[PDB]
RNA sequence: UAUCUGGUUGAUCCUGCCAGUAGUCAUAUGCUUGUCUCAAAGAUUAAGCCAUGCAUGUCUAAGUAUAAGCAAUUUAUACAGU
């Protein structure tokens, strides 16, 4: 018996890897591939104006 | 910038203290008090007690920001502005 939402509905990850080694784990992908293309950017509204934050991704 | 006088007797000269005398960046305290300038101030009694508040925090182009912070526009989809 799945109570109510504790095991139903889920809460995501607040942060992404901050470190290139970490960001390589969390995929899978090996040296040649590269940063830049796999990270989480968030997308920040203040009513009119959208804009976007990211990570800096330290070594 | 080294100063003495009153008090022992009927008077005397002393020996002596006692008293005055002058000061204190030494306290208190009494009246009093307009003015500038400079300013000590719970040491002394109990290093006794203590309400309340404050008395140590610190960031630069240059350790760490995905503040779901601000910014917001004529460097961004890697970060690059506070
Ligand atoms: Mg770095
Ligand atoms: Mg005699
Ligand atoms: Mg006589
Ligand atoms: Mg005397
Ligand atoms: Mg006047
Ligand atoms: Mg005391």
Redesign the pocket.
């Not at 990270?39 to 203040?46: A, F, M, N, S, Y």
């Given at each position: 018996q799945e109570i109510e939402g504790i095991t139903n509905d889920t809460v995501?990850?607040?942060?992404?890897?901050?470190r290139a080694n970490n960001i390589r784990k969390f995929f899978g992908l090996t040296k040649e591939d590269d940063?830049?293309d796999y990270?989480?950017?968030?997308?920040?509204?203040?009513g009119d104006?959208?804009?976007?934050?990211?990570?800096?991704?330290?070594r």
């Open positions: 995501p990850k607040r942060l992404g890897p901050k940063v830049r990270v989480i950017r968030r997308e920040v509204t203040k104006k959208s804009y976007t934050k990211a990570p800096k991704i330290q």
